[PDB]
C-alpha cells in the first residue's frame, strides 16, 4: 500500500493501452460505464459491455487534476 507510483497519465486506459489488442476499445473511463474490477497477474480485469479484456495497470485515469505546466 502507498506503493502506487504509476505514471497513470491520461491516454487509452479502457483498452488499447496494453499493446496486445489495441483496436478493441479506447478511452472513456470515470463518469461512464465499466471500470477496473481488479488487477490479476499484472494486467487489470475489465469487462466492457459483455466483451472481456485485459489492460496494463501501468496506464489508467485517476492521476487527473494534472497540470500541463500552468
Automatic annotation (TrEMBL):
Residues 2-62 form the SH3b domain. It comes from the Bacteria. Belongs to the peptidase C40 family. This is Cell wall hydrolase possible N-acetylmuramoyl-L-alanine amidase. It comes from Bacillus thuringiensis subsp. konkukian (strain 97-27). The chain holds residues 370 to 430 of 580 of the full protein.
Amino acid at each position: 500500500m502507498i506503493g502506487d507510483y504509476y505514471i497513470n497519465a491520461s491516454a487509452l486506459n479502457v483498452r488499447s493501452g496494453e499493446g496486445t489488442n489495441y483496436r478493441i476499445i479506447g478511452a472513456l473511463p470515470q463518469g461512464q460505464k465499466v471500470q477496473v474490477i481488479s488487477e490479476n497477474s499484472g494486467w487489470s480485469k475489465i469487462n466492457y459491455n459483455g466483451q472481456t479484456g485485459y489492460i496494463g495497470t501501468r496506464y489508467l485515469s485517476k492521476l487527473e487534476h494534472h497540470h500541463h505546466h500552468h
